[PDB]
Short mmCIF file of C-alpha atoms (C1' of nucleotides) and ligand atoms in Angstrom, two decimals:
data_model
loop_
_atom_site.label_atom_id
_atom_site.label_comp_id
_atom_site.label_asym_id
_atom_site.label_seq_id
_atom_site.Cartn_x
_atom_site.Cartn_y
_atom_site.Cartn_z
CA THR A 1 15.50 -1.65 16.53
CA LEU A 2 16.40 -3.93 19.44
CA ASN A 3 15.61 -6.89 17.22
CA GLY A 4 16.67 -5.44 13.88
CA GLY A 5 18.46 -8.62 12.87
CA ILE A 6 15.32 -10.71 13.29
CA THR A 7 12.86 -8.28 11.67
CA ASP A 8 15.22 -7.85 8.72
CA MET A 9 15.22 -11.62 8.19
CA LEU A 10 11.43 -11.95 8.37
CA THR A 11 10.99 -8.99 6.01
CA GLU A 12 13.38 -10.63 3.56
CA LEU A 13 11.34 -13.82 3.89
CA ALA A 14 8.15 -11.81 3.39
CA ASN A 15 9.49 -10.25 0.19
CA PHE A 16 10.62 -13.65 -1.09
CA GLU A 17 7.22 -15.26 -0.56
CA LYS A 18 5.47 -12.33 -2.24
CA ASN A 19 7.76 -11.79 -5.24
CA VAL A 20 8.95 -15.33 -5.94
CA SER A 21 6.49 -17.78 -4.37
CA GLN A 22 3.52 -15.51 -5.06
CA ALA A 23 2.05 -16.64 -1.73
CA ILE A 24 0.64 -13.35 -0.47
CA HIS A 25 -0.60 -14.70 2.86
CA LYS A 26 2.85 -15.97 3.80
CA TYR A 27 4.03 -12.46 2.97
CA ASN A 28 1.42 -10.95 5.29
CA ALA A 29 2.26 -13.53 7.96
CA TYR A 30 5.95 -12.58 7.97
CA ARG A 31 5.34 -8.82 7.92
CA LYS A 32 2.87 -9.30 10.76
CA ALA A 33 5.37 -11.18 12.91
CA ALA A 34 8.06 -8.67 11.98
CA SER A 35 5.72 -5.86 13.04
CA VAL A 36 4.83 -7.28 16.46
CA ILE A 37 8.48 -8.12 17.16
CA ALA A 38 9.63 -4.63 16.16
CA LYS A 39 7.69 -3.00 19.01
CA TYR A 40 8.58 -5.67 21.55
CA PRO A 41 10.66 -3.76 24.05
CA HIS A 42 13.10 -6.47 24.98
CA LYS A 43 16.05 -8.00 23.17
CA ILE A 44 14.71 -11.42 22.24
CA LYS A 45 16.94 -14.20 23.55
CA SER A 46 15.00 -17.19 22.19
CA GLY A 47 12.47 -18.31 19.59
CA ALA A 48 10.16 -19.53 22.35
CA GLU A 49 10.16 -16.05 23.88
CA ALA A 50 9.07 -14.74 20.49
CA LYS A 51 6.38 -17.41 20.14
CA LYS A 52 4.48 -15.77 23.01
CA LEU A 53 3.64 -12.86 20.70
CA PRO A 54 0.53 -13.06 18.50
CA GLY A 55 1.71 -13.72 14.95
CA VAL A 56 4.84 -15.68 15.82
CA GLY A 57 4.23 -19.41 15.48
CA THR A 58 6.40 -22.52 15.45
CA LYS A 59 8.17 -22.11 12.10
CA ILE A 60 9.18 -18.50 12.74
CA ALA A 61 10.26 -19.49 16.26
CA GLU A 62 12.58 -22.10 14.74
CA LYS A 63 14.04 -19.56 12.32
CA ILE A 64 14.60 -17.13 15.18
CA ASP A 65 16.40 -19.87 17.12
CA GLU A 66 18.62 -20.54 14.11
CA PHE A 67 19.29 -16.84 13.55
CA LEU A 68 20.22 -16.13 17.17
CA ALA A 69 22.65 -19.06 17.24
CA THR A 70 24.43 -18.60 13.90
CA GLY A 71 23.66 -15.01 12.92
CA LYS A 72 22.07 -16.10 9.65
CA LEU A 73 19.37 -18.25 8.05
CA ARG A 74 20.17 -21.13 5.69
CA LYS A 75 16.80 -20.86 3.96
CA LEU A 76 17.77 -17.30 3.06
CA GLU A 77 21.40 -18.07 2.20
CA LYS A 78 20.07 -20.50 -0.40
CA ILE A 79 17.47 -18.05 -1.74
CA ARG A 80 20.14 -15.35 -2.03
CA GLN A 81 22.18 -17.71 -4.23
CA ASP A 82 19.43 -18.57 -6.64
CA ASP A 83 19.63 -16.54 -9.89
CA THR A 84 15.92 -16.77 -10.69
CA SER A 85 14.90 -15.57 -7.23
CA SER A 86 17.48 -12.78 -7.37
CA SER A 87 16.38 -11.64 -10.84
CA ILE A 88 12.68 -11.75 -9.99
CA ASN A 89 13.24 -9.94 -6.69
CA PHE A 90 15.26 -7.20 -8.40
CA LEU A 91 12.70 -6.63 -11.16
CA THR A 92 9.83 -6.17 -8.69
CA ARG A 93 11.70 -3.18 -7.26
CA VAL A 94 10.78 -1.31 -10.43
CA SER A 95 7.46 0.44 -9.84
CA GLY A 96 4.82 -1.15 -12.05
CA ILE A 97 6.57 -4.51 -12.15
CA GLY A 98 4.82 -6.99 -9.89
CA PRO A 99 5.64 -10.67 -9.22
CA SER A 100 3.84 -11.83 -12.37
CA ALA A 101 5.48 -9.43 -14.83
CA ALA A 102 8.84 -10.02 -13.15
CA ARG A 103 8.66 -13.78 -13.68
CA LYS A 104 7.45 -13.30 -17.26
CA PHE A 105 10.34 -10.95 -18.08
CA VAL A 106 12.86 -13.51 -16.80
CA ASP A 107 11.39 -16.15 -19.13
CA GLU A 108 12.27 -13.79 -21.99
CA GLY A 109 15.84 -13.23 -20.81
CA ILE A 110 15.09 -9.73 -19.53
CA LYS A 111 16.56 -9.82 -16.02
CA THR A 112 18.91 -6.86 -15.49
CA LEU A 113 18.69 -3.07 -15.35
CA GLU A 114 20.43 -2.97 -18.73
CA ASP A 115 17.93 -5.47 -20.14
CA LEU A 116 15.05 -3.21 -19.11
CA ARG A 117 16.71 -0.13 -20.60
CA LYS A 118 17.32 -1.84 -23.95
CA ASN A 119 13.78 -3.26 -24.02
CA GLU A 120 11.76 -0.15 -23.15
CA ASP A 121 9.11 -1.05 -25.74
CA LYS A 122 8.03 -4.18 -23.84
CA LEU A 123 7.05 -2.08 -20.83
CA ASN A 124 3.71 -0.38 -20.24
CA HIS A 125 3.55 3.27 -19.17
CA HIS A 126 3.80 2.72 -15.40
CA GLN A 127 6.82 0.44 -15.78
CA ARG A 128 8.51 2.91 -18.13
CA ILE A 129 8.35 5.64 -15.49
CA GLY A 130 9.34 3.24 -12.71
CA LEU A 131 12.44 2.34 -14.70
CA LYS A 132 13.18 5.98 -15.51
CA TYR A 133 13.22 6.98 -11.84
CA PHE A 134 14.53 3.69 -10.45
CA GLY A 135 17.38 5.48 -8.69
CA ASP A 136 15.31 8.30 -7.19
CA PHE A 137 12.61 5.90 -5.98
CA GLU A 138 15.22 4.11 -3.86
CA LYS A 139 15.85 7.33 -1.95
CA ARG A 140 13.84 8.33 1.11
CA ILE A 141 12.44 11.82 1.66
CA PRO A 142 13.67 13.85 4.64
CA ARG A 143 10.81 15.41 6.62
CA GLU A 144 12.44 18.76 5.87
CA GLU A 145 11.65 18.20 2.19
CA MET A 146 8.20 16.80 2.98
CA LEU A 147 7.51 20.15 4.66
CA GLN A 148 8.52 22.03 1.50
CA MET A 149 6.33 19.82 -0.69
CA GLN A 150 3.38 20.13 1.71
CA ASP A 151 3.50 23.93 1.51
CA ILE A 152 3.74 23.89 -2.29
CA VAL A 153 0.82 21.49 -2.73
CA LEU A 154 -1.31 23.34 -0.17
CA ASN A 155 -0.61 26.77 -1.66
CA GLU A 156 -1.19 25.56 -5.23
CA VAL A 157 -4.49 23.94 -4.27
CA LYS A 158 -5.57 27.11 -2.46
CA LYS A 159 -4.92 28.97 -5.71
CA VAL A 160 -7.27 26.70 -7.67
CA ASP A 161 -10.07 27.00 -5.12
CA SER A 162 -9.97 28.32 -1.56
CA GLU A 163 -12.35 25.58 -0.44
CA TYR A 164 -10.11 22.66 -1.33
CA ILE A 165 -8.58 21.16 1.79
CA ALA A 166 -5.40 19.15 1.26
CA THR A 167 -3.94 17.09 4.09
CA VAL A 168 -0.68 15.19 4.04
CA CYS A 169 -1.18 11.75 5.40
CA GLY A 170 0.78 8.55 5.32
CA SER A 171 4.00 8.25 7.27
CA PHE A 172 4.35 12.04 7.33
CA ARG A 173 1.15 12.45 9.36
CA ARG A 174 2.45 9.73 11.68
CA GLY A 175 5.41 12.04 12.34
CA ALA A 176 8.18 10.13 10.56
CA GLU A 177 11.53 11.88 10.09
CA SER A 178 11.65 10.34 6.62
CA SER A 179 9.08 9.13 4.09
CA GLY A 180 9.07 6.85 1.06
CA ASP A 181 6.67 9.13 -0.79
CA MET A 182 4.06 11.87 -0.34
CA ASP A 183 0.43 11.04 0.47
CA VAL A 184 -2.22 13.74 0.05
CA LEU A 185 -5.86 13.52 1.10
CA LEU A 186 -8.02 16.01 -0.78
CA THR A 187 -11.53 17.31 -0.09
CA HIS A 188 -13.86 19.84 -1.72
CA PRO A 189 -17.38 20.83 -0.56
CA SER A 190 -18.79 20.03 -4.02
CA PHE A 191 -17.92 16.33 -3.72
CA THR A 192 -19.86 14.43 -1.05
CA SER A 193 -21.27 10.94 -0.52
CA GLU A 194 -24.48 12.49 -1.83
CA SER A 195 -23.39 13.98 -5.14
CA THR A 196 -20.51 15.19 -7.27
CA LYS A 197 -21.73 18.73 -7.90
CA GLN A 198 -18.66 19.53 -10.00
CA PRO A 199 -16.68 17.52 -12.59
CA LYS A 200 -12.88 17.16 -12.72
CA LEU A 201 -12.19 18.14 -9.11
CA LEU A 202 -9.04 16.01 -9.01
CA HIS A 203 -8.05 16.82 -12.60
CA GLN A 204 -7.82 20.56 -11.94
CA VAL A 205 -5.53 20.01 -8.94
CA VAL A 206 -3.26 17.76 -11.00
CA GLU A 207 -3.35 20.25 -13.88
CA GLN A 208 -2.24 23.10 -11.60
CA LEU A 209 0.53 21.07 -9.98
CA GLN A 210 1.70 20.16 -13.48
CA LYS A 211 1.78 23.76 -14.71
CA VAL A 212 4.14 24.78 -11.88
CA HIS A 213 6.23 21.74 -12.81
CA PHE A 214 5.78 20.09 -9.42
CA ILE A 215 4.07 17.02 -10.85
CA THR A 216 6.31 15.70 -13.62
CA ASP A 217 4.76 12.34 -14.52
CA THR A 218 1.54 10.34 -14.22
CA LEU A 219 1.42 6.65 -13.33
CA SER A 220 -2.37 6.43 -13.18
CA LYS A 221 -5.32 8.80 -12.91
CA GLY A 222 -9.05 8.45 -12.32
CA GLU A 223 -11.83 10.52 -10.81
CA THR A 224 -10.69 9.97 -7.22
CA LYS A 225 -7.09 8.72 -7.27
CA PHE A 226 -3.91 10.17 -8.74
CA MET A 227 -0.66 8.21 -8.80
CA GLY A 228 2.41 9.94 -10.18
CA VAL A 229 5.75 11.69 -9.80
CA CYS A 230 6.78 15.05 -8.33
CA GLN A 231 9.92 17.14 -7.82
CA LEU A 232 10.85 20.10 -5.62
CA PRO A 233 12.29 23.13 -7.43
CA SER A 234 15.96 23.93 -6.80
CA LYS A 235 17.78 27.27 -6.62
CA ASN A 236 20.42 28.56 -9.02
CA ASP A 237 23.40 26.27 -9.45
CA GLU A 238 21.94 24.01 -6.84
CA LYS A 239 21.86 20.35 -7.90
CA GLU A 240 18.33 19.09 -8.51
CA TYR A 241 16.25 17.18 -5.97
CA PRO A 242 15.39 13.53 -6.67
CA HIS A 243 12.01 12.77 -8.22
CA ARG A 244 9.43 11.59 -5.70
CA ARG A 245 6.36 9.37 -5.86
CA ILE A 246 3.13 11.16 -4.97
CA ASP A 247 -0.34 9.82 -4.20
CA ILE A 248 -3.43 12.02 -4.26
CA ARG A 249 -6.78 10.70 -3.05
CA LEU A 250 -10.04 12.62 -3.38
CA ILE A 251 -12.53 11.63 -0.67
CA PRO A 252 -16.13 12.83 -0.10
CA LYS A 253 -15.95 15.64 2.47
CA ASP A 254 -18.52 14.21 4.90
CA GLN A 255 -16.41 11.04 5.01
CA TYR A 256 -13.12 12.79 5.79
CA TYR A 257 -12.42 10.94 9.04
CA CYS A 258 -12.61 7.41 7.63
CA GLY A 259 -10.58 8.72 4.72
CA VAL A 260 -7.88 10.26 6.89
CA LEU A 261 -7.89 7.16 9.10
CA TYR A 262 -7.31 4.99 6.05
CA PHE A 263 -4.52 6.99 4.42
CA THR A 264 -2.68 7.80 7.64
CA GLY A 265 -2.04 4.10 8.10
CA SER A 266 0.14 2.32 8.49
CA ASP A 267 -0.82 -0.46 6.07
CA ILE A 268 -0.31 -3.05 8.80
CA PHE A 269 -2.11 -0.90 11.38
CA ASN A 270 -5.01 -0.64 8.95
CA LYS A 271 -5.00 -4.43 8.55
CA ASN A 272 -5.11 -4.88 12.33
CA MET A 273 -7.78 -2.26 13.01
CA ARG A 274 -10.13 -3.59 10.33
CA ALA A 275 -9.67 -7.23 11.34
CA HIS A 276 -10.51 -6.22 14.90
CA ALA A 277 -13.52 -4.35 13.54
CA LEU A 278 -14.77 -7.57 11.93
CA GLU A 279 -14.38 -9.41 15.24
CA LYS A 280 -16.34 -6.64 16.96
CA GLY A 281 -19.05 -6.85 14.31
CA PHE A 282 -18.15 -3.90 12.09
CA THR A 283 -16.48 -3.28 8.75
CA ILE A 284 -14.29 -0.29 7.95
CA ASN A 285 -13.23 1.14 4.61
CA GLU A 286 -11.96 4.57 3.57
CA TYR A 287 -15.52 5.90 3.44
CA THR A 288 -17.58 4.51 6.31
CA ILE A 289 -17.78 2.11 9.21
CA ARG A 290 -20.72 -0.28 8.89
CA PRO A 291 -22.19 -2.96 11.15
CA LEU A 292 -22.22 -6.60 10.10
CA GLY A 293 -25.61 -8.27 10.30
CA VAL A 294 -25.84 -11.93 11.29
CA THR A 295 -25.90 -12.03 7.52
CA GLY A 296 -22.50 -10.87 6.51
CA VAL A 297 -23.93 -7.95 4.48
CA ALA A 298 -23.12 -4.46 5.79
CA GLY A 299 -25.77 -2.16 7.23
CA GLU A 300 -25.94 1.62 6.91
CA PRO A 301 -22.99 3.94 7.65
CA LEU A 302 -22.88 4.76 11.36
CA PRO A 303 -22.42 8.44 12.32
CA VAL A 304 -18.76 9.50 12.34
CA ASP A 305 -17.68 12.93 13.62
CA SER A 306 -14.02 12.24 14.39
CA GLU A 307 -11.23 9.67 14.12
CA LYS A 308 -11.89 8.77 17.75
CA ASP A 309 -15.49 7.80 16.94
CA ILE A 310 -14.20 5.02 14.69
CA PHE A 311 -11.94 3.75 17.48
CA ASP A 312 -14.88 3.97 19.90
CA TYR A 313 -17.25 1.76 17.87
CA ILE A 314 -14.86 -1.18 18.05
CA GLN A 315 -13.85 -0.64 21.69
CA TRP A 316 -10.32 0.63 20.99
CA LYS A 317 -8.74 3.39 23.05
CA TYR A 318 -7.71 6.18 20.69
CA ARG A 319 -4.20 6.09 19.23
CA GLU A 320 -2.57 9.23 17.85
CA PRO A 321 -1.05 9.08 14.32
CA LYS A 322 2.48 8.58 15.69
CA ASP A 323 1.39 5.44 17.57
CA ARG A 324 -0.06 3.87 14.42
CA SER A 325 3.29 3.00 12.83
CA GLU A 326 2.91 -0.78 12.86
"C1'" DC B 1 -7.69 -29.95 12.29
"C1'" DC B 2 -9.83 -25.94 8.82
"C1'" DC B 3 -9.89 -21.82 6.83
"C1'" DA B 4 -9.89 -17.09 6.31
"C1'" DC B 5 -6.49 -13.87 6.17
"C1'" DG B 6 -8.74 -5.32 5.22
"C1'" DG B 7 -10.69 -2.96 1.62
"C1'" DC B 8 -10.57 -0.82 -2.72
"C1'" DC B 9 -8.79 2.52 -7.23
"C1'" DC B 10 -6.74 2.32 -11.84
"C1'" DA B 11 -4.71 -0.12 -15.99
"C1'" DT B 12 -5.10 -3.95 -18.76
"C1'" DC B 13 -7.14 -7.85 -20.92
"C1'" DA B 14 -10.57 -11.59 -22.20
"C1'" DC B 15 -15.11 -12.10 -23.78
"C1'" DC B 16 -19.68 -11.05 -25.96
"C1'" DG C 1 -18.66 -0.63 -25.97
"C1'" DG C 2 -20.12 -3.14 -21.22
"C1'" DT C 3 -18.82 -6.22 -17.78
"C1'" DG C 4 -15.87 -8.74 -15.02
"C1'" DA C 5 -11.19 -10.88 -13.82
"C1'" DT C 6 -6.46 -9.92 -12.95
"C1'" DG C 7 -2.14 -7.30 -11.95
"C1'" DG C 8 -0.11 -3.64 -9.37
"C1'" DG C 9 -0.56 -0.76 -6.01
"C1'" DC C 10 -2.47 2.65 -1.90
"C1'" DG D 1 2.62 -18.88 8.30
"C1'" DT D 2 -0.53 -18.30 11.97
"C1'" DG D 3 -4.53 -18.91 15.01
"C1'" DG D 4 -9.71 -19.03 16.61
"C1'" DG D 5 -13.35 -22.07 16.80
N1 LIG E 1 -1.60 -2.07 1.67
C1 LIG E 1 -1.85 -0.82 2.01
C2 LIG E 1 -0.99 0.18 1.59
C3 LIG E 1 -1.31 1.47 1.98
N2 LIG E 1 -2.45 1.77 2.78
C4 LIG E 1 -2.69 3.19 3.17
C5 LIG E 1 -2.04 3.45 4.51
C6 LIG E 1 -0.73 4.10 4.14
O1 LIG E 1 -0.21 4.81 5.28
C7 LIG E 1 -1.24 5.02 3.05
C8 LIG E 1 -0.12 5.38 2.07
O2 LIG E 1 0.55 4.16 1.61
P1 LIG E 1 2.15 4.19 1.52
O3 LIG E 1 2.58 5.54 1.01
O4 LIG E 1 2.57 2.96 0.53
N3 LIG E 1 2.73 3.74 3.04
P2 LIG E 1 3.16 4.95 4.08
O5 LIG E 1 2.96 6.34 3.69
O6 LIG E 1 2.37 4.51 5.51
O7 LIG E 1 4.73 4.82 4.51
P3 LIG E 1 5.92 5.30 3.49
O8 LIG E 1 6.79 4.25 2.97
O9 LIG E 1 5.19 6.04 2.34
O10 LIG E 1 6.77 6.45 4.14
O11 LIG E 1 -2.05 4.14 2.28
C9 LIG E 1 -3.27 0.76 3.15
O12 LIG E 1 -4.31 0.93 3.80
N4 LIG E 1 -2.99 -0.55 2.77
MG1 LIG E 2 3.49 7.09 1.85
MG1 LIG E 3 1.93 6.41 -1.14
NA1 LIG E 4 2.36 -16.76 18.91
NA1 LIG E 5 7.29 -3.08 -8.35
#
DNA sequence: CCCACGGCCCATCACC
DNA sequence: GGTGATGGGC
DNA sequence: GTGGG
């Protein structure tokens, strides 16, 4: 974090544009510039120096010049003093409350943590849980604990069926010493791009994790994606662990590599790799990589036998998980 | 100067 | 109930 | 907010 001051500012600007302005491309623009600056190995001495990087234009250069001279940004000082912006920004930190619901709550006078707790009935299920574990969801997860959770999930899934393969992805797979949540990619031989030869493959895994009281809540649940809450078990007299967010994604087994590429991330790395794919004449999702015709309609899935194959198609030298933290 | 900005699962809602 | 848009999120 | 064509 040579330029922590700058990337903090841009991130705060990104969050403002997303939550308050509801201008999602300004949000992406700021997080993009913040990302490319974060890996810049020198201590930026000027906005013009920053402008040389792809993603940093004139406006951000100006803001960097102001920040380096005064240590702060007036655009942000103002935003920080607005009640509406502060209320809306706070509300969006509750899982299940997006920019729209946040602004709508404020119109009704519901703008504090106490307001949410007294008005539980005006929340849907996701928001109710997000409020419930608002404190825990602010806490990060030490890799030490991620290791415990990994072993539990993997052993529980082995117990359901020895042919399930569960892989922890996300920031954990990228080698982070701390994670915001747990991300699990799941495969089973019965579920391929060809056919689902067995119903409820994800349900049974969730069921099992619920019966050992690992999974405690459910935010959403379909045939391929689980979004919910989990908690490590504690020993006698030992104070309980915080509740953690957990994401489980069931992917067709023959499409494991695109799946594990996708959910390893990061989100910004994924954005960059797929944009580059489009430039190179391909399109990548969590299932396949396809060519673009002169048309703009995708062709057939190209053969993929590894993560490196995907990198190869678009003329990218392979980058290990720990070098994908953009 | 113009425009597109990665790709998609689940919950909810509007409409027929 | 089917379909499609929208919100929130990965 | 930024940048390729
Ligand atoms: N916008 C997004 C968000 C997530 N993802 C994929 C890549 C992420 O690594 C993976 C999990 O999302 P995530 O849990 O919100 N972020 P991630 O695990 O990378 O970092 P953490 O904050 O969880 O530690 O989903 C994506 O492709 N596009
Ligand atoms: Mg994660
Ligand atoms: Mg996640
Ligand atoms: Na630039
Ligand atoms: Na939220």
